[PDB]
Amino acid sequence: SDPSSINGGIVVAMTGKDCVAIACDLRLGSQSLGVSNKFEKIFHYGHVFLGITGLATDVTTLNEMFRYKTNLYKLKEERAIEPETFTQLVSSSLYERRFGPYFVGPVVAGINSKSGKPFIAGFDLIGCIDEAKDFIVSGTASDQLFGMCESLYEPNLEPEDLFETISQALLNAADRDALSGWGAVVYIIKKDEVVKRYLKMRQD
Amino acid sequence: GYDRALSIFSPDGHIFQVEYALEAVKRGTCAVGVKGKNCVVLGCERRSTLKLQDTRITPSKVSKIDSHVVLSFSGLNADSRILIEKARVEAQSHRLTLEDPVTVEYLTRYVAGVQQRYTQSGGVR
Amino acid sequence: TTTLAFKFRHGVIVAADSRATAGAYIASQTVKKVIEINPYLLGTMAGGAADCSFWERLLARQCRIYELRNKERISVAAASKLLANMVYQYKGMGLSMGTMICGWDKRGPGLYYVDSEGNRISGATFSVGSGSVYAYGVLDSNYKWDLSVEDALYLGKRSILAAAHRDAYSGGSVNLYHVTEDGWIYHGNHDVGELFWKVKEEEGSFNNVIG
Amino acid sequence: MDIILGIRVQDSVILASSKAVTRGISVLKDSDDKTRQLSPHTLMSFAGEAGDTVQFAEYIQANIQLYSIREDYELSPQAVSSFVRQELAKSIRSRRPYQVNVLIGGYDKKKNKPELYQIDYLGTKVELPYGAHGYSGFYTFSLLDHHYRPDMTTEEGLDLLKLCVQELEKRMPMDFKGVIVKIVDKDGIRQVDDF
Amino acid sequence: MDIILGIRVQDSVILASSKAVTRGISVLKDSDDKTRQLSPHTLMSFAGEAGDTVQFAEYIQANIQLYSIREDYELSPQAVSSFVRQELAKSIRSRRPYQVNVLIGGYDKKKNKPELYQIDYLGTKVELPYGAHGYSGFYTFSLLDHHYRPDMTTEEGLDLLKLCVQELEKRMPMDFKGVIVKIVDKDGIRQVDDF
Amino acid sequence: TTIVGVKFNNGVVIAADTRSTQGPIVADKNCAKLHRISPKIWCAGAGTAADTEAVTQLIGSNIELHSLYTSREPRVVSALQMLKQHLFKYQGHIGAYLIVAGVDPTGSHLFSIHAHGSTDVGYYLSLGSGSLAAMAVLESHWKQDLTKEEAIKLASDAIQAGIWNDLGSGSNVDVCVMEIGKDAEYLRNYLTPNVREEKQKSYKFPRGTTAVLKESIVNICDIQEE
Amino acid sequence: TQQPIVTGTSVISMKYDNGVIIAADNLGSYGSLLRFNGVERLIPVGDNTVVGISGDISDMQHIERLLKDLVTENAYDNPLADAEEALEPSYIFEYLATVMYQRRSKMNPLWNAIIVAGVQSNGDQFLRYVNLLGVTYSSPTLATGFGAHMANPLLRKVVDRESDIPKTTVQVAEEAIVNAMRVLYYRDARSSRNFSLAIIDKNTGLTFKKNLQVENMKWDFAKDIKGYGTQKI
Amino acid sequence: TSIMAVTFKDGVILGADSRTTTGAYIANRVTDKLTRVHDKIWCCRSGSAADTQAIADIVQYHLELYTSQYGTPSTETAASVFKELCYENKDNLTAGIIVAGYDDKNKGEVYTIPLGGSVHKLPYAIAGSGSTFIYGYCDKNFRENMSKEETVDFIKHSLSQAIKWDGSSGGVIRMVVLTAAGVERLIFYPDEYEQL
Amino acid sequence: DIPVEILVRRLSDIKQGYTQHGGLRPFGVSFIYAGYDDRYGYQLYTSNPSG
Amino acid sequence: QFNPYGDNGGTILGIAGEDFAVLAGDTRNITDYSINSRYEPKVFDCGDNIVMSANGFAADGDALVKRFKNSVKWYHFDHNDKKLSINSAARNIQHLLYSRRFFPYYVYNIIAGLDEDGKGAVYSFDPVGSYQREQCRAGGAAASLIMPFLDNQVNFKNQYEPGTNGKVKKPLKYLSVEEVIKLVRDSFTSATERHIQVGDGLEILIVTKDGVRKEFYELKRD
């Protein structure tokens, strides 16, 4: 019944030293039933990454919507959109449905191409921005992720170290949530290279 | 909205805008239709003033309205697209509501009705 | 939960997962859903953990006083019926139990399904729990009477795995039991995480999953 | 309606749909075809509330047929599935949503690959090797998870489907009156007349 | 449980009861016998809510068997049916009523006549040539009203019963997994092993 | 949330905590609740977080256009009027509870505003879940003819009362001072009484601890030449 | 199960170096009607305990009778009733807490929130809370109803933790309590100006002050407040 | 709330308490419920603070526009505008308003507008939750053509009792005197009116 | 990605509309469309104010 | 309508060592958004080298503990001062809980001590008596925040040995009391940051063959 927990899923983002990381599980379900183990929740528009949890139809819809809006932004501005600017666009777009909202928990992650500053942000379903320095969590195991991130995280981690921290935060949170799991992906993002890693986890 | 009466009668009982529309048809490339015992053939002229044309992608003169009906024309090319689109929509609408494809006579009657409507509606030619 | 049990030539197989849930939160993953009532009687648990635990432990004490007064081990049918009558008193009051009483007695291997609704059914094959529906597919397709102990143990194990994979509220580990006329035999605790990958490679199944 | 299954094999997509239509305590029909051909190489099966199902399917059919005539070109199964999803995602926030779940089976002639898409009434799309709607998948997924290979022949896919249906007929309380089976491949769409 | 039928012919009573037991979306069993022998020439079939059915039948069985031992005499089907009715009429105004409907088929050895009684959970008793509980009679009564004679043989009664079951299997949405059939006559109670 | 507003001799000061919740969970430990409507008109917001932002950004946008149209510096009463009429129209469904303060050509002003559109005037005000803890302090220590330094102290003391005694409030104290004839000074994290202690252990993992299946480079660049 | 009819609002209290202080106003409200103006809600038990009660007044009067009867019963066959075997604050509290939890467990509660304040035999300060649910807790400061929201923050500024108790004098503690009662009069719509205050000191014993009033109030600034926004006159 | 308006020889006086509540919490203890819609036409507000403010603001707008076109409006005219809003939007409002004003021709006039949106012209009026407790006192003590000092004492004593018994009433007693001489604001603090 | 012709037809239909209804002046523009898609490959089109 | 239940917040945590066991819990007591007490003990020494903590609805938790302490007292009287083993206490507690199956104790409950082989033991209970011996368990408001961390740092879940890449797991090496107390403090410090009902103080009870020892650490008061 609760739209935010029908399909299940989780997303987590972290900052490091001159880098950011964003990760998600791959499960799509119909409550107790597992339907897909390939439902990726992270999308990118140029160098800006967006993770979305919640109702799967709205996840798919918002991706198509922000792809639409960022493609137009680029044609007019003659440049790729930045994370700070994209974050405001996501907030604007969600609040325009204030009284008929998308049931989602978006997470933005990226590095400003000009200043080189790492950036992450989270939102509620109606657009409120949570701009954090350390980490952002979202999903059915958000309580679990808050506990893992708040204890495992330390600032100024190197990319290959950050990878292990975020991966363990996701994996162990997902294994305490019935509606999350069935695979996982981690994006490691630097100013001009992005690596994507699929994790091996329990398939139950 | 623009409501101006463009198609109107003249003292001698003529609607000039409709008659001037026939002059546009006279200017258009020749189209011919011949029906045999068990077939119909539609022939169309292509003016050779336009070479360096890409014949793969250039709009063909004969248009399929449905799988069993075709429509060719003479006159303004841009105008023909509007009639063809309407005819195609109606063809699917007929299949959808009556569970039979349109008869050729029905489709013709629809297209002809659209043309007539544009001879006594305000703001349109 | 997912639990199953089935009769066959060489006794009865009993298998169950180990997950315990409180909403979406996985509270435990080390729960014993098979209770040892006597060296020849097993009981499965599904639904209310507290309910199933209390009433089946209380039944085991009824079955023991029976043995003392009568100099005879209780039958599977009598044991299943004592439970059924016990829970019937509290019918409509809120109890949530889905159990199977597995054993070997004078009539050979016995297997009864008992629930809080009032049902008490004898049968050769059962599966109860949220993941039962997934397990039935594997059982029904591969179940014989002329099944070897080795193949029968694998079937019950593979059936739980099928459910543990699909059902969100099933998983953790697989507990196996084999009941003979000389009594039940524990056949270990098997982590689904490790078991899944093993089965995938050796069997070739779960091709859709990457590993 | 009740059970709709789908399985993508090596060179084709197989859709199996139940035949029963039910109004209350009475079976009105036992030979209902719960499918519409959207294009020569794209088939859509469907199930949900009465009226909504057929109204939606025929509405989609009309739109794809219109596209085909306008462009003289067949849309890819992926393009069709995306169009259908948008219509359902649009529907779910409307005054009265279409209560319909669909499977779209198609053969992409460009890539020479069969494709199967599962879409529910909310607009939740997923590409799968095999899928089901409602209580169907609950009984059938364990067998498909076990037996399915991506290099299966059409005949092997049908045998696995018979096994899935046999399980449904044993454990489902409702009598769905068997299934109509259709195969979608490079040569088009055809019905298996004996199943 | 689902369907229970009864038909009184010339020299016997035939009871047909479905085999399925269902818990939610799953068929737990397909060979359930929904009947208890109350005495050598009296059989009771039953259907209603889980637990209540078997608890009540076995309670009645125990009471009639106790009477038989105490008196060394078999109660008439009429006497048994009256006892059962009183227990249900007593039950309906209790804290938690038995939710059970029964058919009692018996052969009265004194009158040399078969007798069939239909009793619902309220304690509503009626003697009939043929009867049914739940949604069963809705499908079967038109055939019985048409074909039934009181001078029918047991074999003719079984053929008419097959016709009733065939109609149920065609028009009922629920699969009840066939029926167990039992005949009550002068020689006692026996089961038709092939139906 | 806890938010306050206190008037003084030659101006007005507002303050707020920095906690944002989602049930019993803290979503943000350093949230910014002090919003700028115009350069010298700031408001503190409690309630539905998105609503306090959106309603503030909107009225601030319209205030800027008004200021440009009239060639005048915006007034607090204008922001107040525009806010209450907007909130009243949505009949409480926009859950914004605001304290609006500022300086303008008319002088210094301090107002509160509720979600249903009612406004109140005062020398000291408090809103949010910690408003009672804060008002207890204000009623005990407020006096007429406060200095700037006394008012900042009173305001932050009132927020602290909410931080310590209200579970809906916590972390840091933000302040904004609006004095007549001066630029408004926004004091982000004026107080930081809730820094986390050092952890007992480092949970940095050995590289190679996590099991991986696949690796791939993600193409973020555009389509290339040649 | 019932609903409260005639009610009493906040009861506030705190520990100090040599004892405890407790206070409560003299009002018995009837919904929004301030019906009864002479209601005593602090009830002494011996010379070492004061029970402060809020909530339903009919249930308060019942509890008051239970306590009076408790004293009578303790004196029975007890030569040391005014000495070693006198009633302690901890005895009185546990009895009430037992009754409150039993009544909630029968779904027929005493609709009250109670604070038991006193000094034990060994000179230790006793201050514990109990309510209609049987829930109990102790703290250096305790308050019921609105006092929990407004008084506790003010009293916790004096005694923030256990180590602040020896540093707090009776003059400072009383001053804080009296200020809190003023604040509650400003802000609680079901409060009165008249209140009672009780001090239980390990040296000077029980001091019970009646007919106290909230004084030194600030209202003068109200004259400058005009309209609700734009109005000037 | 506790509000009242009383006509007397030289004009009319409005009176009110200063309490606004959210349940049992006093959200503001120094509220000004006496609001001006025209130079010498004021109103007393009771009910929803949001509704009564929105209404009074709209009325002030209407009368400001009236004045620009047709000159000074009558107190009856002001009461009619209030009524029109309160009556036509009765399903969505919770406002109990007393309208009071001074003309030179009509002198002091008082109109009360309860929940339904009906209008009632009276010599004096009382309204708000606290008014219930002083119906008897006011009926017994009111006289027509009182002096300014007599009328101030009448309102002071009346609202004193209303405040005493009603928990939803309290704070200071505000008053506004409307005469030919002009507009005078009065305030009376707890220490003054409680001892009456 | 939109096929080239479909985009061209849409713009040309908009131009056509201004010549048949509305009473407004047409767009004084002629386009050369250069594009690629996987059906026809590289394509050149032109449109003029007639649509 | 009268609601006989309430929520007093709080969070507890039990960890079993090789020859010791700890039971930790915060000292904060709350209703809604108010703080009742910053120091209200929640973990108790119940005798026979057993520690217990039952809470959620404080009044039901206080009653259960009070009853179990009483049960220990009567176990000595009735069975010749015999020591109540941890497994026997667990089973006894099940029956205290199920005696109110139709008007439950609204609590999370954990006991800790040593088994009859001298090894550390932790038992966990649901409100109606379902109990489980475990190595690591958190209960209460922030249980979901803490448990995943303990799965990782106590049982080494999802942790493999570098170089093998997922082929070989991290071996299950036992933890010392000093290492365990670090995990406890870090668990509660992390929970205090993200959960509003957790804070003020942390009381830890350690159980060895020598007896029961206490440790107290401050937490954030916001």
Ligand SMILES: *[C@@](C)(CO)[C@](*)(O)[C@H](CC(C)C)NC(=O)[C@H](Cc1ccccc1)NC(=O)[C@H](CC(C)C)NC(=O)[C@H](CCc1ccccc1)NC(=O)CN1CCOCC1
């Ligand atoms: C599969 C895993 C799920 O279907 C199995 O069926 C297992 C069977 C095993 C455990 C024997 N069942 C459960 O996991 C079962 C599901 C369930 C829950 C509640 C009622 C019926 C069935 N889970 C439980 O019994 C859990 C076990 C705990 C987590 C160890 N118990 C609870 O959820 C308890 C029991 C509550 C209860 C039952 C009857 C009357 C009163 C209370 N409830 C709580 O702890 C409270 N709950 C905590 C989480 O936050 C929400 C409130």
Ligand SMILES: *[C@@](C)(CO)[C@](*)(O)[C@H](CC(C)C)NC(=O)[C@H](Cc1ccccc1)NC(=O)[C@H](CC(C)C)NC(=O)[C@H](CCc1ccccc1)NC(=O)CN1CCOCC1
């Ligand atoms: C103190 C801290 C609490 O009173 C303050 O008042 C602050 C005010 C500041 C931050 C502006 N208030 C909050 O932090 C506020 C409390 C709150 C919660 C719910 C309703 C009203 C007020 N918190 C929020 O508004 C959060 C902000 C997030 C954490 C960035 N938002 C939510 O909790 C939203 C509520 C959205 C909403 C929609 C419609 C009407 C009212 C509120 N809730 C969720 O996102 C929960 N859920 C997650 C899964 O996806 C579905 C929604």
Ligand SMILES: *[C@@](C)(CO)[C@](*)(O)[C@H](CC(C)C)NC(=O)[C@H](Cc1ccccc1)NC(=O)[C@H](CC(C)C)NC(=O)[C@H](CCc1ccccc1)NC(=O)CN1CCOCC1
């Ligand atoms: C006396 C008090 C009674 O007649 C006076 O009439 C004064 C009049 C002056 C202030 C105009 N009235 C009030 O103080 C008025 C009483 C009231 C309360 C609720 C509805 C109508 C009248 N108080 C208010 O309007 C407050 C003012 C806020 C605090 C600034 N507003 C509320 O209490 C709002 C109103 C929402 C509403 C509800 C129903 C109808 C209309 C509006 N209510 C809340 O904020 C809800 N509140 C929080 C949760 O607990 C319940 C109460």
Ligand SMILES: [Cl-]
């Ligand atoms: Cl107001």
Ligand SMILES: [Mg+2]
């Ligand atoms: Mg999981």
Ligand SMILES: [Mg+2]
């Ligand atoms: Mg699972």
Ligand SMILES: [Mg+2]
């Ligand atoms: Mg789907």
Ligand SMILES: [Mg+2]
């Ligand atoms: Mg008062």
Ligand SMILES: [Mg+2]
């Ligand atoms: Mg905290």
